[PDB]
Design a protein around this ligand. Structure first.
Ligand SMILES: Nc1ncnc2c1ncn2[C@@H]1O[C@H](COP(=O)(O)OP(=O)(O)O)[C@@H](O)[C@H]1O
Ligand SMILES: Nc1ncnc2c1ncn2[C@@H]1O[C@H](COP(=O)(O)OP(=O)(O)O)[C@@H](O)[C@H]1O
Ligand SMILES: Nc1ncnc2c1ncn2[C@@H]1O[C@H](COP(=O)(O)OP(=O)(O)O)[C@@H](O)[C@H]1O
Ligand SMILES: Nc1ncnc2c1ncn2[C@@H]1O[C@H](COP(=O)(O)OP(=O)(O)O)[C@@H](O)[C@H]1O
Lengths: 755, 648
């Protein structure tokens, strides 16, 4: 294996003529940064590129994009040869023609529309016969290079002539460059990695499994909310590995007559086996094999059995992978997930803020977004949006831009000029309107997130922070030393104290600091899961916690369900609170084996909490969160005002001294009322602009920077007029009569000295 | 490749294995097994392999003769089911190994066997092993395949199978997934659904006389099928293939890694301890994932490609502990909710004190079962109901586990929340199922914990006046305990923390009528508990323990364990801070020397114990002790009766 032989890799930058290598890789071949490098591919193909040094890449791997790989007829992870050749010289004339399959409906000067920005200031190497993709005008166009002066390869220069006259060329056997790839899917990085590591061996190296004799995975079930992108992921995996893709739709198979439905699956399996390696995607598999409780027999029980038979009908491996897709794991019957039929399961959940931003950037790559568009704000605003909703939002923004452009020009005809299409810019107003018009679809889904709260957002509670670190961070980040002492740490924490003191913030901060997933569940949410209880849902939550390890499972508002039976709980009819409490106890007893899931509970009435929760193996550790002291009150005031442009004539310290018995929520409410007063004052000052000009039309422009109207001492004094304490004095002593009994430290202070 | 150095060189290394011309042998390696057939040898027919003996191997592979495959399932390919394997072997040894004897004796042999357990537990594996190791003919019937086909064809397939099996007697018919063919009669689906099952029943009676044919069913739950299948003659035998225990899981892991070259650092015992709720299929998948991870790591550095990997390359792959750890972390169990019938590892030495309770438990439990021939001599039947009461966290569950282990009896643990969680639209059979699982596992100890949730008195000391959940379960428990007295080898032990509010229906004779009070440990027992909790922790030499026991008054065993846990956490923090010094010093001075002179143990010192004792909390108030004493004395009647009864 010569040093000039490497393994291709996917690149972060999507430039069509840029290849990234580590400096150590280039040192072995005398390659320098910014040079011109030839790469040889398969089936007698080759390309020319330029090199950039990136330290993130590794020596064995070379980074390229999809277009270069398509030109080289190679796939990801394949082996290529890299050579250097200084014969690449400046060319005089290069003749390029577009592809007929992509230029339908657009007629005009494609030169200034696409090629002029494409070759502007970039010395992109060009080889005769290759193809490249240009994105613009809300579409993508394939251009195939026809001729060039310097033999086969050349460098485009400002003085180089670019010939483009001629009819569009006809597509050859080369694959489409607009098909789905790994760059067309966003927010599913972990699941994408799992699927890639599951399917890399059976697909990229099939014959190896004839030699080793180990059975590769066969059945994969993807589940998630509709529109989350299961089919997109399947198609991307199939395309980027070069596999043959056969798509089976559940409605189509089920709709057809009996016997035909059984024959279609057999034909599909036969074709996939004959065209191995291949991927069979059974879209919407829930319709074919529903749960056995349906009690509908005859034909309903035939095909599913046949399906099971045909799942076992694959007598031996044939480089064939079946990929199911449903909405809920419990929707299908258990017999489908036996050993050999469907062994692998992946959850494609609703994306988070970063995933939503990635999807938005994916769906706007053909659009010319204006400079004022802020996709980060849109990603923050869209909560409960699946990728389909984001795609629809982008389409609506594009359509609004098209409507605004057509409002002023009556283009009509049959083909819009390419320059006109490229001149359309989508602004922030279109996105705002489309976002306001649209509605989410995955609001009720349990979100598994990594919170943004850190320790710096919490005012005080330093001892609680230290105890939480010792309790949570060490068992997971440093597990190799806990086993040395032979003592297994407890995984149950219960925060108790006055309401609005920072228990949820502490849970989010400890989840974020350990870089662990966070799941938040409330008592009303547990009770709302139908009073004709579907008792599996609670278990589902723990299941979602089990596959997301490491994770922090936070239960809030336990006082609604976790009250003692009869002694301190209303509703003696029962069946709702007691049932959920028993299910929680059983799940917490059964969760001890995961070793990486921490359960945190919060309550505001620790005296009436059920004693069954405090037993070992359950939330047996108790932490008391008190009202913040004056230093912590100063910290909370500073934290609440981290963004508000507060005026310089402020004290804050006397605010902390004055606010006794006020919780953090009360401080936040005081700041909110001060902000409202400042808003009112700013509005009244803005009204002066209209009033003065109405009283005198000859008034001059007074728009000398907008009046900030900072939070001044007057606003704070007005807000403090009705500042209400949320906790009475009796609450503090009630909590103290539980903390001291749960500490046993008033009489044990430095009184145990032994040698 | 060079199969010689790959397989034969280690096979004949230092072993003087006799070799006969014409035989075959199996060599395991490279994640596979290879059959080698001996062709020739110099000393006539038999010879002894020696280091100076030439080994010729050049030539094409031979073609398989009528000899059976050596990779087929056998008794060594099944693990963790030793008792059930013995039962099946003793049930099928006579009809299969000695068939014609049943034409002479005239006694009807067993015909129908139903194996049940969680999916993936290994029912088909057991059936195939039994069929192969007895030389019987094996016909496999799959429920989905029979049910899927059209009407009339489904009835004809069973008839053809029975005809073929009878014509090729002795034989075993395995009806895999029999639950689909004959579900419970409550399905209320008629016509075809009622045809085949009836036909099945007919074909179960269609075997007019014995024909050296054994039918072997396989379902998931005994109550899933209709009762008419288990009539006299159709399906008379039933075996439960439950989820394996730690030893069974270790056996399965060793079974599935016999073709793999495990590295020296692999500790399968830790994996067996870690995997809880894993059926054999899950363990097989885990081993396959570890092997695949090893293959990926090996392919990461070499681009072998071609079409056939060299045998030496395959044999060079070693599976390490990191691969097993990663695969175990990735995998998830499948039998978590199954009732586990285990033999606990707790012994008397793990319990601090309670010597009188240990003696009473021995007299109550061990003697009636280990020495039953002398109880009948006196003519008095011992009671089988014990109720532990006392403060929480004092060792009632430990006592139950220890008494189960000392008698070498199975242990089943059930909690009140588990009983209530069995749907509030109660499937009332589940409680009975537990007792049924106790009945077939005799001798067994059935331990009920946290009875205070369901066993409170009706109305007087129980919340939720709507009813239907706690009272129903209490009535079912009373009925089952009344009906359990006939087994003579099942002991029911209950534990509660509020004996004053317990229902008086439980204390009647024939039920948990014996009461034992477990008190807070005394100072000697506190010393014993401190010693037991620290049996593995490397405690420092500057410790007293005795003054710890003296100081901890009103602290339960759980409190002592929590104190030790907090001390361990403090030691962990100190060790982490000391480890950070290795990075800090080298960052402040890159020319620092290697200070890795054995890892700092950071033993539990007096400072850690003193820090932990700062917030050491008593879990029981002083009122709890007197509340329990106001029940113990009334349940003992011994304050006024001490050595006051002297008669001759
Ligand atoms: N994670 C994602 N990234 C980018 N696009 C997505 C994503 N999820 C869904 N989409 C878009 O949604 C459209 C249809 O979604 P689809 O995959 O059919 O839904 P389902 O997964 O329920 O079958 C696709 O055209 C795709 O562009
Ligand atoms: N110690 C604190 N530091 C910063 N913010 C706080 C603190 N305590 C309360 N807050 C504010 O109070 C609001 C709600 O408090 P929350 O944590 O929900 O109360 P609880 O602990 O009762 O759930 C949060 O938005 C948070 O900003
Ligand atoms: N006790 C066991 N020992 C060894 N392997 C087992 C055991 N139980 C299950 N397996 C493995 O599980 C695989 C399939 O299990 P199977 O017997 O088909 O499940 P079921 O019993 O539900 O039909 C078999 O290939 C076997 O190797
Ligand atoms: N006498 C004792 N000897 C040893 N350990 C004990 C003792 N009492 C309590 N423990 C410890 O307390 C923990 C839980 O006690 P447990 O037996 O569950 O209490 P309960 O009897 O209320 O069920 C166990 O892990 C055990 O190690």
């Amino acid at each position: 294996k010569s040093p000039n032989r490497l393994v291709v890799d996917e690149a972060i930058n999507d430039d069509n003529s840029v290849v990234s290598l580590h400096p150590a890789t280039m040192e072995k071949l005398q390659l320098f940064r910014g040079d011109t490098i030839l790469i040889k591919g398969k089936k007698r193909k080759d390309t020319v590129c330029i090199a950039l040094a990136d330290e993130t890449c590794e020596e064995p791997k070379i980074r390229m994009n999809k277009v270069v790989r398509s030109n080289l007829r190679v796939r990801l992870g394949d082996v290529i040869s890299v050579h250097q050749c200084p014969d690449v010289k400046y060319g005089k004339r290069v003749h390029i023609l577009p592809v007929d399959d992509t230029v339908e409906g657009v007629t005009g000067n494609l030169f200034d529309a696409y090629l002029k920005p494409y070759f502007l200031e970039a010395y992109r190497p060009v080889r005769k016969g290759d193809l490249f993709l240009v994105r613009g005008g809300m579409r993508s166009v394939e251009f195939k290079v026809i001729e060039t002066d310097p033999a086969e390869y050349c460098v485009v220069a400002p003085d180089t002539e670019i010939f483009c006259e001629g009819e569009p060329v006809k597509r050859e056997d080369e694959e489409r460059l607009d098909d789905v790839g790994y760059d067309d899917v966003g927010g599913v990085r972990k699941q994408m990695a799992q699927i890639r590591e599951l399917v890399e061996l059976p697909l990229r190296h099939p014959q190896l499994f004839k030699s080793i004799g180990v059975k590769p995975p066969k059945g994969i079930l993807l589940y998630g909310p509709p529109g989350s992108g299961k089919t997109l992921i399947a198609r991307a995996v199939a395309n980027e590995t070069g596999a043959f893709f056969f798509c089976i739709n559940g409605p189509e198979i089920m709709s057809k007559l009996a016997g035909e439905s059984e024959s279609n699956l057999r034909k599909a399996f036969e074709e996939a086996e004959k065209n191995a390696p291949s991927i069979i995607f059974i879209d919407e598999i829930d319709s074919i094999a529903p749960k056995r409780e349906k009690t509908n027999g005859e034909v309903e029980r035939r095909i599913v059995s046949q399906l099971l038979t045909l799942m076992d009908g694959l007598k031996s491996r044939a480089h064939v992978i079946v990929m199911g897709a449903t909405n809920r794991p419990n929707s299908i019957d258990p017999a489908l997930r036996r050993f050999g039929r469907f062994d692998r399961e992946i959850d494609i959940g609703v994306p988070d803020e970063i995933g939503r931003l990635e999807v938005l950037r994916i769906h706007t790559k053909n659009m010319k977004l204006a400079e004022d568009v802020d996709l980060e704000r849109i990603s923050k605003d869209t909560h409960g949006y699946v990728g389909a909703d984001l795609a629809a939002l982008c389409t609506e923004a594009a359509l609004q831009c098209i409507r605004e452009k057509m409002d002023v020009i009556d283009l009509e005809d049959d083909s819009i000029d390419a320059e006109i299409l490229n001149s359309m810019a989508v602004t922030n107003e279109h996105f705002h309107t489309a976002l306001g018009n649209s509605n989410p679809s995955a609001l009720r889904e349990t979100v598994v997130e990594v919170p943004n709260v850190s320790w710096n957002d919490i005012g005080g509670l330093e001892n609680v922070k230290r105890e939480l670190q010792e309790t949570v961070q060490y068992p997971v980040e440093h597990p190799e030393k806990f086993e040395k002492f032979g003592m297994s740490p407890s995984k149950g924490v219960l925060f108790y104290g006055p309401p609005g003191c920072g228990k949820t913030l502490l849970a989010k901060a400890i989840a974020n600091e350990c870089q662990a997933n966070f799941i938040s569940v409330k008592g009303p949410e547990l009770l709302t899961m139908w009073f004709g209880e579907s008792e599996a849902n609670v278990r589902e939550i723990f299941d979602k916690a089990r596959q997301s390890a490491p994770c922090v499972l936070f239960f809030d508002e336990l006082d609604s369900i976790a009250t003692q039976r009869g002694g301190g709980s209303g509703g003696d009819g029962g069946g709702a609170a007691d049932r959920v409490l028993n299910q929680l106890l059983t799940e917490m007893d059964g969760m001890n084996a995961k070793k990486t899931v921490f359960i945190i509970g919060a309550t505001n009435r620790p005296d009436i909490i059920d004693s069954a929760l405090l037993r070992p193996g359950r939330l047996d550790q108790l932490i008391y969160i008190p009202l913040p002291d004056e230093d912590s009150r100063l910290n909370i005031f500073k934290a609440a005002l981290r963004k508000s442009p507060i005026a310089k004539d402020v004290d804050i310290g006397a605010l902390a001294k004055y606010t006794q018995g006020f919780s953090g929520a009360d401080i936040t409410e005081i700041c909110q009322r001060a902000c409202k007063y400042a808003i009112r004052e700013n509005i009244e000052k803005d009204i002066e602009k209209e009033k003065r000009r109405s009283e005198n039309p000859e008034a001059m422009e007074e728009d000398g920077v907008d009046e900030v109207s900072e939070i001044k001492a007057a606003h704070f004094e007005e807000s403090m007029k009705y500042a209400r304490r949320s906790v009475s004095d009796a609450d503090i002593r009630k909590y103290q009569a539980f903390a001291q009994t749960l500490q046993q430290s008033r009489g044990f202070g430095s009184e145990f000295r032994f040698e």
